Amino acid sequence: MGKNDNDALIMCMRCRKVKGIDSYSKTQWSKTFTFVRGRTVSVSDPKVICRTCQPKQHDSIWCTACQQTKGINEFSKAQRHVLDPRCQICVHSQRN
Ligand SMILES: [Zn+2]
Ligand SMILES: [Zn+2]
User: Fold this and answer.
1) CB 20 within 8 A of CB 32
2) What end-to-end distance do the CA atoms of the chain give, in Å?
3) Residues within 5 Å of ion ligand 2 by Cβ?
4) Residues paired with residue 32 on neighbouring β-strands, in sequence order
5) From ligand 1's centre to the CA of 22, what distance in Å?
6) Do the Cβ atoms of 63 and 37 come closer than 8 Å?
7) DSSP string of 9-75?
8) Where, residue-wise, is CATH 3.30.60.210 in the chain?
9) What is the C-alpha to C-alpha distance for residues 28 and 49, in angstroms, rounded to an integer?
């Protein structure tokens, strides 16, 4: 499960930087090999990027109740429509 085969280093095509499963996501690193006839096989040419090389953005809503940035996950849909969104926690704190 990592006796010595965990020293594999995948070259990044983005920053031409070579790193191990450390700087490589498990999902991306897994693409280094595929399953054939029920046998593990190394991909001929696996194209992957670094964790930082890949994009990462998420929508959020500014709250004036606590003056803290929060995602839309912890924010009700209606709270997003209003002109003054309030965290699902702030609303239960201000008794609205
Ligand atoms: Zn990279
Ligand atoms: Zn708030």
Assistant:
1) no
2) 54
3) 63, 65-66, 87, 90
4) none
5) 13
6) no
7) EEEPSSS--EEETTTS-HHHHHTTEEEETTEEEE-SS-----TTTS-----EEE-SSS--EEESTTS
8) 1-57
9) 7
Class of domain 1-57: alpha beta
How was this model experimentally determined? NMR
d(CA 22, CA 11): 13
**Residue 27 and residue 22: Cα distance in Å, rounded?**
12
DSSP 7: G
Q: How far is the CA of 17 from the centre of ligand 1 (A)?
A: 6
Distance 32 CA to ligand 1 centre (A): 15
